Design a binder for this molecule. Structure first.
Ligand SMILES: [Mg+2]
Ligand SMILES: [Mg+2]
Ligand SMILES: [Mg+2]
Ligand SMILES: [Mg+2]
Ligand SMILES: [Mg+2]
Ligand SMILES: [Mg+2]
Ligand SMILES: [Mg+2]
Ligand SMILES: [Mg+2]
Ligand SMILES: [Mg+2]
Ligand SMILES: [Mg+2]
Lengths: 129, 252, 88, 151
RNA sequence: CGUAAAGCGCACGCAGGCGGUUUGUUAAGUCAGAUGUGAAAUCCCCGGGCUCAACCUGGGAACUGCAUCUGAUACUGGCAAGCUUGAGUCUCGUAGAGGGGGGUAGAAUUCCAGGUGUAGCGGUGAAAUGCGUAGAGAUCUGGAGGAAUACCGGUGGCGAAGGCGGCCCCCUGGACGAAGACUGACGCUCAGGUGCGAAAGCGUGGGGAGCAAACAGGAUUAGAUACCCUGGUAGUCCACGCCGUAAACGAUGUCGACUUGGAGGUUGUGCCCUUGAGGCGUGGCUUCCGGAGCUAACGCGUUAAGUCGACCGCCUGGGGAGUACGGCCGCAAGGUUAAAACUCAAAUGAAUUGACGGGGGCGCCUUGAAACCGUAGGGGAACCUGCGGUUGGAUCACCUCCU
RNA sequence: UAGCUAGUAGGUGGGGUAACGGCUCACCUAGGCGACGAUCCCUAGCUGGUCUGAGAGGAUGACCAGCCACACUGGAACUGA
């Protein structure tokens, strides 16, 4: 059955990127919206939006730079089979700091770059570059 | 077809035979000169059958051997070993090696002469030898091994690798010796009753003997003999088989 | 595998109204009635393993529904298993 | 087990006695290789070097006229601190001494033995088997070893 | 983990793991900070001292931890409340060798009873054994009995898998579409566990047409145990027990999401049909191509072997060996779980080029050239035979070298 | 190596220790433990550390420091802080 709604959106991003799709869409959820926001805030996508009351849909507009996908790697480290937590300093570096990790802290979701200078460890969602 | 090639095991077989005068010795299937020579050597004089008349000429014309043996040129299953036992003064030592389709016949013809034979000494294929000596409670056991162990005491002599043979087979093979009992440890009223009891039983070896020998005897007969009819045919020793044979013969 | 009318009697007993089908009560009741009826089938048709594969699916489905209702509301659970005499 | 054991003995005797050494035992085994094992002794002594000499000689003087060469290799040996032994005269040197035997007769009152040599007959070894005594023919035995006490 | 070793024969299901979505609450996990503690020595850093070094030594750092307190509230967990997308009920249809039970039909073989009839029949390469003058064989009629469903029938349907095929009835399982309605996360997976599970064989009692291990007898062959033939028991059938394995293989675990196309098949359904054909759609199932990607390669390819999430099963060189032993299980066969010593430098998968070779066609292109699985029984062999499953239907390999 | 256990598990009361306590004893209850591996059998003193390893790990516990146990073998008990 469905057991990871986040890996589902990330694999939709990958598969949509590889399929050259201008956008991809998902059953929305509050966490997915926050995720989509932080990766728009690091510029990995053109835009995201949500459409419809009751059942919701979250659409992601995939970014292509000249001839190619902007995201080339996206993977999620907190398997629902085993969660992952890191201290404020133990927040990892993606592509030696070129890339991003996503941290759910007790003051919300943010990039590892934000989280380490904010002094908060937390749970780690995923890596992207 | 096969005959041996390597002196080590040839010498082992002919020495293990212990062929000397004071014994009524006769070869069958002299084959290649290499294994018939040492036995025709150690016995001052020796009898032989070869089935082939051309090989019988090759060996009878061989001056090591023709002057040192008396030679016969026919199917041994025709041959009157009971008269040869009289001509050789005492019951025979019968021995050698063959193409061995004839093996199954050899045993029955030898058993037709259990009086006229003192002992038998022969090479045979691994599976049939291990069957021939098999203990009653084993899958290797069965009707032909029963009849063999009925007629004679049976004794493996030595075992030989396949590269030892002139055309080397894939199949390891052993020389075996056997001894018609001086008195039958299992006295029997007839052997045809044994032969048919054993074939019926082994033709049905997966089912209970109530569903094998109990197709002829009753369960109350079998248990009356002291035999549990719920056994399988391959649980049953030659002792109770000859007891059944006597029961069949004497109650008929 | 049930007549519309036996279904109607059961849903009009265990159901909220005629608009309800598939409230847990409706389900477990009609499922139970089917299971009860099929005892007569298998009491003749011992060797009907392919049919009894459906029966095994049904009794386990009954168990799953009951256990959900038991954790959702013990009162509805206890009065429902009382009415059907379930946990017999 | 050997080919033509007397012929083999004499062909081996020629370099053995040319070296002034003495034969003791000849035995062959048939298996993964098939191989020939020569026991030689000389009571001044046999070194590894004396084995090396007679072995290089037989490795020539037998091979060039081999009656058989199947899978062949050989070794020459001192007869061990527990020694294989083969003849009436051997057991006769060793009357009163502990032994093990395996036989061409293969029957209960088991013809596989531990023994102390009681006396030698012209045809037989008489031996304190199992602290009992019994006698076995030189022909009804097939292999024997002496002072098995030494491991 | 398709073929190199590896996905339980299949399914259900307990424990266990895992779990959509919204709001409140909690604050266990988690995070942050503090406090106590984490022996010294050792380690590391920064110094000092032995002429240097090793060595010694000052001071720091480190001691990933544990406890306690304090906050933090995203996420996870708990609690509470809901939600309808997952799950599932209902109403109406649809297709189907799905299963269980009971009748019944036309072919067919054999057999019996005649009838007509007469020297042959039968069998093979040819023979023989076999059958017939007591009349066979043949052919007509009449009867018996057991077994199986010609054709449709398909690159076709159903079924968890094993499997399911004359026809009708009776009971009965599942599936898919339609259009709503309803419940309200009720879910997935699943160690143990439980049950289903070809063929063979066993157990108890029937049946026995045809076929046929074993067996028997005739032939063939250097031999022939085979291959051939004439016979023939078990078995094959049935009811009721058992066994519990198969190349039980898509050699491919279950569930869920995503990701180019294309040509079919089959089975619902909507709309348009000008009708009847058509033509727009639109589920389900299913076959073959093939893009991307993947893959050792072969190949796989939206029914993945692509991209991924949850759980389970399994493998860790080759032999020894699925063998020992022990336990369990079985009526017995055997099943099952399962070693090690010992031994070897491999063993192995795919694919390339010559042989192939026997050729085959026209010096040239290039092939007229069974293995196994499970199981039961014979047994000169490796082997032979019966039952039914799978396809993985075959070869084998010699003279040196640097930029 | 699957079940284990009768002072066994718990209770009351008596006795007992420097001290709590089946520590022990009377009675009384029928518990208690275990597939989150008890029970059983093999093997081992433990630890700061040490060696290796990029690291995670793996190996290991000689010397030095901390803890433990033992003192011909097996039994006790005196005295004393
Ligand atoms: Mg494999
Ligand atoms: Mg499978
Ligand atoms: Mg959750
Ligand atoms: Mg919560
Ligand atoms: Mg039967
Ligand atoms: Mg059957
Ligand atoms: Mg086994
Ligand atoms: Mg199949
Ligand atoms: Mg007290
Ligand atoms: Mg490493």
């Amino acid at each position: 059955s469905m057991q990871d709604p986040i890996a589902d959106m990330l694999t939709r991003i990958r598969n949509g990127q590889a399929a050259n799709k201008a956008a991809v869409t998902m059953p929305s959820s509050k966490l997915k919206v926050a995720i989509a926001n932080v990766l728009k805030e690091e510029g990995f996508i053109e835009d995201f939006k949500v459409e419809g009351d009751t059942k919701p849909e979250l659409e992601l507009t995939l970014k292509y730079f000249q001839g190619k996908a902007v995201v080339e790697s996206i993977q999620r480290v907190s398997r629902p089979g085993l969660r992952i937590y890191k201290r404020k300093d133990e927040l990892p570096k993606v592509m030696a700091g070129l890339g991003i990790a996503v941290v759910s802290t007790s003051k919300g979701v943010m990039t590892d770059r934000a989280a380490r200078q904010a002094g908060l460890g937390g749970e780690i969602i995923c890596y992207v570059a | 077809q096969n005959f041996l090639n390597d002196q080590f095991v040839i010498d082992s077989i002919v020495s293990a035979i212990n062929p000397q005068k004071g014994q009524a010795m006769v070869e069958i299937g002299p084959g290649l000169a290499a294994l018939t020579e040492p036995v025709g050597e150690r016995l001052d004089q020796l009898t032989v059958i070869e089935l082939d008349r051309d090989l019988a000429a090759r060996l009878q014309t061989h001056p090591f051997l023709g002057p040192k043996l008396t030679i016969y040129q026919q199917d041994a299953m025709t041959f009157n070993f009971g008269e040869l036992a009289e001509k050789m003064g005492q019951p025979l030592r019968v021995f050698g090696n063959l193409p061995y389709n004839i093996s199954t016949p050899l045993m029955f013809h030898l058993f037709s002469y259990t009086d006229a034979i003192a002992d038998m000494h022969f090479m045979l294929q691994k599976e049939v030898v291990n069957r021939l000596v098999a203990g009653p409670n084993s899958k290797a056991y069965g009707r032909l091994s029963v009849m063999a162990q009925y007629y004679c005491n049976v004794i493996p002599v030595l075992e030989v690798p396949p590269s030892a043979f002139t055309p080397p087979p894939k199949v390891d093979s052993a020389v075996v010796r056997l001894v018609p009992h001086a008195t039958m440890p299992h006295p029997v009223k007839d052997v045809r009753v044994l032969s048919r009891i054993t074939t019926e039983a082994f033709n049905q070896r997966r089912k209970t003997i109530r569903n094998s020998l109990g197709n002829l005897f009753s369960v109350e007969v079998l248990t009356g003999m002291g035999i549990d009819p719920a056994m399988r045919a391959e649980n049953i020793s030659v002792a109770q088989y000859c007891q059944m044979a006597n029961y069949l013969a004497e109650n008929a | 595998s049930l007549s519309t009318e036996a279904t109607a009697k059961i849903v009009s007993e265990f159901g909220r109204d005629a608009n309800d089908t598939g409230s847990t009560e409706v389900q477990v009741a009609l499922l139970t009635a089917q299971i009860n009826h099929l005892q007569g089938h298998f009491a003749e048709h011992k060797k009907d393993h392919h049919s009894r594969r459906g029966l095994l699916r049904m009794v386990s489905q009954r168990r799953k529904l009951l256990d959900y209702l038991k954790r959702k509301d013990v009162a509805r659970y206890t009065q429902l298993i009382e009415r059907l005499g379930l946990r017999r | 087990m050997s080919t033509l054991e007397q012929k083999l003995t004499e062909m081996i005797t020629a370099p053995v006695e040319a070296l002034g050494f003495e034969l003791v035992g000849i035995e062959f085994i048939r298996g993964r290789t098939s191989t020939l094992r020569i026991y030689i002794d000389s009571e001044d002594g046999i070194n590894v070097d004396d084995c090396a000499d007679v072995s290089h000689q037989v490795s020539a003087v037998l091979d060039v006229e081999d009656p058989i060469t199947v899978a062949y290799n050989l070794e020459v040996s001192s007869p061990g601190l527990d020694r294989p032994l083969f003849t009436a005269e051997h057991y006769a040197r060793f009357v009163g001494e502990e032994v093990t035997l395996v036989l061409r007769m293969a029957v209960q009152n088991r013809r596989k033995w531990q023994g102390v040599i009681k006396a030698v007959d012209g045809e037989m070894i008489t031996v304190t088997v199992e602290g009992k005594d019994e006698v076995f023919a030189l022909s009804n035995i097939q292999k024997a070893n002496l002072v098995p006490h030494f491991a």
